Amino acid sequence: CSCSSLMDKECVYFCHLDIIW
Amino acid sequence: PPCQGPIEIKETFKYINTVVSCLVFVLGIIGNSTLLRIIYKNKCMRNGPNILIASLALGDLLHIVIDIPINVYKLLAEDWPFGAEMCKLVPFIQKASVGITVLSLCALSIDRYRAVASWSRTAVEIVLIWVVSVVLAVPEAIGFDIITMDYKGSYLRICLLHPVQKTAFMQFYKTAKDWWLFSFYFCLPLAITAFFYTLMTCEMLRKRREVAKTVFCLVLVFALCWLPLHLSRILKLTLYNQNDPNRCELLSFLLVLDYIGINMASLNSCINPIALYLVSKRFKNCFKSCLCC
């Protein structure tokens, strides 16, 4: 998914668990 | 960094989602394959509006094939071992299929309006619709990329819309992907189909309730089945914060919202053959003949 940057760990972890869309 | 809570998915929801996804996948594939078989085999059924319906069916079938399996893999594995190019194409194919489906719904609504409005009663439209659908999915085909991480000890790899990108327009897409998707793949087809079907009913007033009921059911199911995913993504974009422990709960709940919404989208893909059965006598007999033998 979309994240502000690579420093926001939780957003990218959600991207890991989120659907492909 | 910690939110005062981890991120995880309940197992009950996983079981429910797996069962629902299996059932909707099977139903949609059977229905769309049967519709395509009927339209292709029967020469009398090879006609403009029927070719539009076949386009919609093929788009829905390709949409089902590419979404449910990968989401099942995500839930039951929580990994993406397919490499960068596979995740480079999957969003592209997914958005192309969604565009094909929505534009085919629009074209079919236009065709029904024409059929009911004019009594004198497609190749260019289908090619135009499909080409425009493939090109609009190009940004997904150049945008996504894989990134590595450490997270509380566990080393992870995620394929996503990497925030850092090369060009100004590519960065603009990286920033407005979800807004673009909600404003094109959902609002535009909903509005077009609803308006054209309203015109069809208005003409029937100028000149049978069952067909209007079918129209209402189709539009309502489309709305109710494509709303949840867009709602989840806009909620992410709107209520997600940072630097403070007020975001992890939202992410955990958004997992559930997104998976429910993708099941509903698959159900909308599955819906149309059922309607064309319960409404059309010709399609009813065709389904009886194909399925029962």
Numbering used by the authors:
A (entry chain L): 1 to 21
B (entry chain R): 88 to 208, 218 to 303, 318 to 403
Give the authors' words.
The endothelin ETB receptor is a promiscuous G-protein coupled receptor that is activated by vasoactive peptide endothelins. By contrast, the ETB receptor primarily induces vasorelaxation via the nitric oxide-mediated pathway, and it acts as a clearance receptor that removes circulating ET-1 via the lysosomal pathway Bremnes et al., 2000. The ETB receptor is known to be a promiscuous GPCR, capable of activating multiple types of G-proteins Inoue et al., 2019; Doi et al., 1999. Here, we report the 2.8 Å-resolution cryo-electron microscopy (cryo-EM) structure of the human ETB-Gi signaling complex bound to ET-1, revealing the unique mechanisms of receptor activation and G-protein coupling.
We refined with a mask on the receptor and obtained the receptor structure with a nominal resolution of 3.1  Å. The agonist ET-1 is well resolved. The extracellular half of the receptor superimposes well on the ET-1-bound crystal structure, and ET-1 interacts closely with the receptor in a similar manner. The ligand binding pocket is essentially similar in both the crystal structure of the receptor alone and in the Gi protein complex. However, the W3366.48 rotamer, which comprises the bottom of the ligand-binding pocket, differs, thereby leading to the activation of the intracellular side of the receptor. The downward movement of the residues is larger in the ETB-Gi complex than in the ET-1-bound crystal structure, which consequently results in the outward displacement of the intracellular portion of the transmembrane helix (TM) 6 by 6.8 Å as compared to the apo state, and by 5.1 Å as compared to the ET-1-bound crystal structure. Upon receptor activation, the ionic lock between D1983.49 and R1993.50 is broken, and R1993.50 becomes oriented towards the intracellular cavity, similar to other GPCRs Zhuang et al., 2022; Rasmussen et al., 2011; Ring et al., 2013; Cherezov et al., 2007; Manglik et al., 2012; Huang et al., 2015. In contrast, the N7.49P7.50xxY7.53 motif is altered to N7.49P7.50xxL7.53Y7.54, where Y7.53 is replaced by L3867.53. As L3867.53 is a hydrophobic residue, it cannot form a polar interaction, and hence in the ETB-Gi complex, TM7 is not displaced inwardly. Moreover, the intracellular portion of TM7 is displaced downward by 2.8 Å.
